[PDB]
Design a protein around this nucleic acid. Structure first.
Ligand SMILES: [Cl-]
Ligand SMILES: [Mg+2]
Ligand code: NA
Ligand code: NA
Ligand code: NA
Length: 309
DNA sequence: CGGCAGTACTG
DNA sequence: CAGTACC
DNA sequence: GCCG
């Protein structure tokens, strides 16, 4: 990254727009930050700034300002509210609208939130685990969590396949949470297992809090036994076997890689979701493998580690 | 001008 | 429904 | 914010 002196200050702007709710501008800043953290060179011209995909006139100009004096005028005019809004929206279950409302109501610290805010069930759990959920775990811990879920699943039906996705599958040394995808090659036995699986995992003390318990996805909180353990975010998603390849791809990510794939799909008159690759309500195309998705998009296969965009 | 993804939960 | 979350 |  020959441009960490540009990206460091752009990231302040990106975050300010993100937590203030301007999600599209925040998207544009993040793309430009990704582009600039990947070029071949330092950028030292406005005509070179425009050179790169994701950098336009206004973003060029901002490069051409750090160009000169080593800072961006715009940074000194970010609302004093941004760090508080960032604090509040780092509570799981609170996003930008809730953070702006708390701010408007005069809350300024997590002590204010604890003592005076009305919290949803999810947000009270997010607040209780505030620090823990900002921490990444070693991937060796994601492994133990995956194999905990697998053992409980395969106990009830040994045909069940369980796979940790997310940053774990992309090979990262640390993970923000664990995403366990479950399916069954028989095409039917995947259904209705959550009752049994989740109560099994509660039986250990392993599952400590539920955030979401739907018919096909569970989002919650777990903790391995013993000393020195922290609470970890855990998602479990159950999918029909015919959808396994698209689910693997979607839940392996990264989010920027998926977004680049949806856009490439759109150039070919197709659509790509966690459930399927389809034509324009079109037809679902058969994708038994991740490799088939790439092939039908006319792309060469990328292993999970080269999707970490 | 307007897309930049679609859906599953929660309440 | 609006809001939040998943990659 | 960028881009078509
Ligand atoms: Cl596959
Ligand atoms: Mg994850
Ligand atoms: Na949040
Ligand atoms: Na008060
Ligand atoms: Na997750």
């Amino acid at each position: 990254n020959h441009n960490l002196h540009i990206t460091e200050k752009l990231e302040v702007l990106a975050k300010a727009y993100s937590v203030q709710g301007d999600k599209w501008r925040a998207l544009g800043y993040a793309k430009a930050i990704n582009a600039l953290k990947s070029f071949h060179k330092p950028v030292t011209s406005y005509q070179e700034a425009c050179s790169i995909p994701g950098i336009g006139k206004r973003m060029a100009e901002k490069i051409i300002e750090i160009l000169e004096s080593g800072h961006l005028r715009k940074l000194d005019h970010i609302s004093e509210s941004v760090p508080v809004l960032e604090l509040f929206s780092n509570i799981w279950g609170a996003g930008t609208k809730t953070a702006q409302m708390w701010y408007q109501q005069g809350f300024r610290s997590l002590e204010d939130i604890r003592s005076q805010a009305s919290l949803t069930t999810q947000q009270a759990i997010g607040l209780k685990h505030y620090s823990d959920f900002l921490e990444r775990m070693p991937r060796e811990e994601a492994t133990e969590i995956e194999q905990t879920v697998q053992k409980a699943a395969q106990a009830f039906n040994s045909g069940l396949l369980c796979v940790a996705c997310g940053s774990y599958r992309r090979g990262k040394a640390t993970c923000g949470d664990v995403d366990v995808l479950i399916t069954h090659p028989d095409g039917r036995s995947h259904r209705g297992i959550f009752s049994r699986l989740l109560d099994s995992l509660r039986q250990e003390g392993f599952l400590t809090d539920d955030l979401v318990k739907g018919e096909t996805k569970y989002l919650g909180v777990c903790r391995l036994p013993g000393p020195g353990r922290r609470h970890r975010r855990l998602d479990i998603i159950v999918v029909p076997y015919s959808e396994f390849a698209c689910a693997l791809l979607y839940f392996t990510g990264s989010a920027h890689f998926n977004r680049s794939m949806r856009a490439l799909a759109k150039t070919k008159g197709m659509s790509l979701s966690e459930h399927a690759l389809s034509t324009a309500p079109g037809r679902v195309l058969p994708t038994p493998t991740e490799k088939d998705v790439f092939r039908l998009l006319g792309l060469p296969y990328r292993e999970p580690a080269e999707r970490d965009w």
